[PDB]
Amino acid sequence: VNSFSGYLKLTDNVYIKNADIVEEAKKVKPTVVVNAANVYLKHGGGVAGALNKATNNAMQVESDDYIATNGPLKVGGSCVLSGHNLAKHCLHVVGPNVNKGEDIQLLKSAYENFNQHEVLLAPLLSAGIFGADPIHSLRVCVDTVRTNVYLAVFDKNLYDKLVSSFL
Numbered sequence: 001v002n003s004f005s006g007y008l009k010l011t012d013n014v015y016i017k018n019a020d021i022v023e024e025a026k027k028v029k030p031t032v033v034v035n036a037a038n039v040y041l042k043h044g045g046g047v048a049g050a051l052n053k054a055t056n057n058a059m060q061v062e063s064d065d066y067i068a069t070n071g072p073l074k075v076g077g078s079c080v081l082s083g084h085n086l087a088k089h090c091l092h093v094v095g096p097n098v099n100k101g102e103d104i105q106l107l108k109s110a111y112e113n114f115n116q117h118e119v120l121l122a123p124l125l126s127a128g129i130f131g132a133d134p135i136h137s138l139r140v141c142v143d144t145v146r147t148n149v150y151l152a153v154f155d156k157n158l159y160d161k162l163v164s165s166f167l
């Protein structure tokens with residue numbers, strides 16, 4: 001038993017809610033919150049900008065040190081950093097950004113990172129301003145992640161569309 005509330009069960013291990021991931025994190029304090037990162041960990045907008053703002057820019061400061069030491073992530077890759085005031089850890093996952101011309105085929109690899117964590121609070125990868133088809137991303141999530149994932153979808157109209165179209 002865990003502390004998430006009001007989530008809709010989709011499969012054996014995936015739950016979904018129309019909510020702000022920052023507020024779900026402030027409430028639950030999950031072991032792992034997933035950020036929809038880019039390879040440079042430059043947290044400008046979307047999930048990343050929102051999470052980073054909620055940490056008072058501490059996420060960005062930590063991320064800049066990570067990049068200075070390790071160099072950029074790979075598209076499809078991830079790193080574990082602090083969750084600051086939002087969670088124990090933040091799993092920064094790079095899904096392909098279609099608006100950058102990146103390969104949507106790498107979405108499955110991005111979701112595979114979730115399998116290294118027993119429970120996660122996460123956004124839908126490559127959705128929103130990342131420019132991919134969100135229905136497709138939800139399909140990839142359910143067909144790839146085997147650990148327990150709680151998805152927080154910000155846009156209400158998107159949430160309603162995803163639920164009503166889910167197979």
Ligand SMILES: O=C(O)C[C@@H](NC(=O)c1ncnc2[nH]ccc12)c1cccc(O)c1
Pocket residue numbers: 019020021022036046047050095123124125126127128129130152153154155158
């Ligand atoms: O509309 C959606 O769910 C898709 C969208 N989500 C959010 O921007 C978002 N999700 C949950 N909590 C949030 N709090 C503040 C913003 C926010 C998104 C954007 C970029 C990358 C990505 O993978 C997903």
